Amino acid sequence: PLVHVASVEKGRSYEDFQKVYNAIALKLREDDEYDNYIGYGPVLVRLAWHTSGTWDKHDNTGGSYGGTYRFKKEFNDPSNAGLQNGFKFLEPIHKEFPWISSGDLFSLGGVTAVQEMQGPKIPWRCGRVDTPEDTTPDNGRLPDADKDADYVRTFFQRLNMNDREVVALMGAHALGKTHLKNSGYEGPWGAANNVFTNEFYLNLLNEDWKLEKNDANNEQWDSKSGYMMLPTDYSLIQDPKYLSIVKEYANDQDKFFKDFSKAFEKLLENGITFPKDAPSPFIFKTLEEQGL
Ligand code: HEM
């Protein structure tokens, strides 16, 4: 294969997208009670990831382009349990700005969330185009959590991600938490659940982890601070290549920020062809920078 060519929403420029960014950012600030005062930031990051992470480099199916999460087949993927709360948050935004494509809106939600939680700037490109219901990918393309480093590595090859990209992207588990009813895992990865930092790598290295079984009969790694790691998270310190990179990001916040920003942009852009006459990527100002 498919070719997906980016097409700018008719007549729109930087100023129109910054308005949508601001609407999202303001609502994140306002609807702050969700999930015991974590807010909607983490679920929006997860949503941008799950809508992008269906991509397959072999035939160019899936990915962020088509916005196919709106269709029932993908919406009801058991892997997507809990993301309805992100979709509902974005629905009134989409009504206020009905000219934005679904894929642009889901991806921009992730960018906005990261920046407003004090993460790196993520350059973002517009032009995703809604595609028909029969372009929805089948369930099963998102990863399982009960596997090891070899599975993680192999899985991310399908998205054209290398070891450094994978380790960088996984740092997003600083954000939010697992929810028993959604995934069969329970607890947060850290203390500051709605601030983007390199805390995931710090906790992985410095906590004393014990293999326990949770109320859904799944194994997870638990620490005495009250944190948890999935088996896929913990595997990053079992594999010697991953461990070297985990140590790097634990000791250099700025490098983690830069590498995350590139890998996350790539994730969101996988499968899309941008014409040479396409506008350059936008960098949005945060509310804080606008004095808002
Ligand atoms: C091996 C790859 C991954 C696995 C197996 C995995 C698995 C999971 C699971 C099971 C949850 C809990 C869902 C719930 O109970 O609500 C979760 C949450 C989350 N994931 Fe991952 N994930 C992976 C990679 C990623 C990536 C690559 C990103 C973003 C770049 C990401 C961002 C998040 C965030 C922000 C949450 C918190 C959501 C919330 O608080 O509602 N994850 N992940």
Please indicate whether residue 42, judged by its CB atom, sits closer than 6 Å to ligand 1.
yes
CB 122 within 8 A of CB 282: no
Q: How far apart are alpha carbons 32 and 221 in whole angstroms?
A: 29
**Residue 50 among the catalytic residues:** yes
**Same topology between domain 1-142+264-292 and domain 143-263:** no
Q: How far apart are alpha carbons 118 and 196 in whole angstroms?
A: 6
Please state, as a whole number, how many other Cβ atoms lie within 10 Å of the Cβ of residue 78.
Answer: 10
What DSSP character marks residue 206? H
Q: Give the CA distances from residue 17 to residues 44, 93, 102, 213, in Å, rounded to whole numbers and listed in that order.
A: 17, 12, 13, 45
Please indicate whether residue 185, judged by its CB atom, sits closer than 6 Å to ligand 1.
yes
Site of tokens 């920003």: 261
Ligand 1 atom nearest the C-alpha of 45 is 35
Site of tokens 């009801």: 76
Atom 20, ligand 1: residue with shortest CA distance: 46
Backbone angles phi, psi at 242, to 5 degrees: -60, -45
**Cα 130 to ligand 1 centroid, rounded to whole Å:** 25
Please state, as a whole number, how many other Cβ atoms lie within 10 Å of the Cβ of residue 176.
Answer: 23
Using alpha carbons, select from 195, 176, 196, 194 the residue that is nearest to residue 249. Answer: 196
Q: How far apart are alpha carbons 256 and 32 in whole angstroms?
A: 27
The CA dihedral of 127, 96, 119, 258, to the nearest 10 degrees, is 10
CB 190 within 8 A of CB 227: yes
Give the tokens for residue 34: 């969700």
**Cα 8 to ligand 1 centroid, rounded to whole Å:** 30
Q: How was this structure determined?
A: X-ray
173 is in an annotated binding site: yes
**Cα 203 to ligand 1 centroid, rounded to whole Å:** 16
Using alpha carbons, select from 69, 174, 48, 155 the residue that is nearest to residue 117. Answer: 174
Using alpha carbons, select from 53, 29, 51, 52 the residue that is nearest to residue 40. Answer: 29
Domains of the chain, residue spans: 1-142+264-292, 143-263
User: Given its phi and psi angles, is residue 186 left (phi above 0), alpha (psi -120 to 50 degrees) or beta?
Assistant: beta
Q: How far out from the chain centre does Cα 173 lie?
A: 9
Please indicate whether residue 177, judged by its CB atom, sits closer than 6 Å to ligand 1.
yes
CATH architecture of 143-263: Orthogonal Bundle (1.10)
Provide the angle, in degrees to the nearest 10, between the axes of the packed helices 163-170 and 149-157.
110
Please state, as a whole number, how many other Cβ atoms lie within 10 Å of the Cβ of residue 155.
Answer: 18
What DSSP character marks residue 222? E
Which of 51, 165, 173, when mutated, tests ligand 1's pocket best, judged by the most ligand atoms within 8 Å of its CB?
173
Q: How far apart are alpha carbons 78 and 140 in whole angstroms?
A: 9
CATH architecture of 1-142+264-292: Orthogonal Bundle (1.10)
Q: How far apart are alpha carbons 242 and 149 in whole angstroms?
A: 8
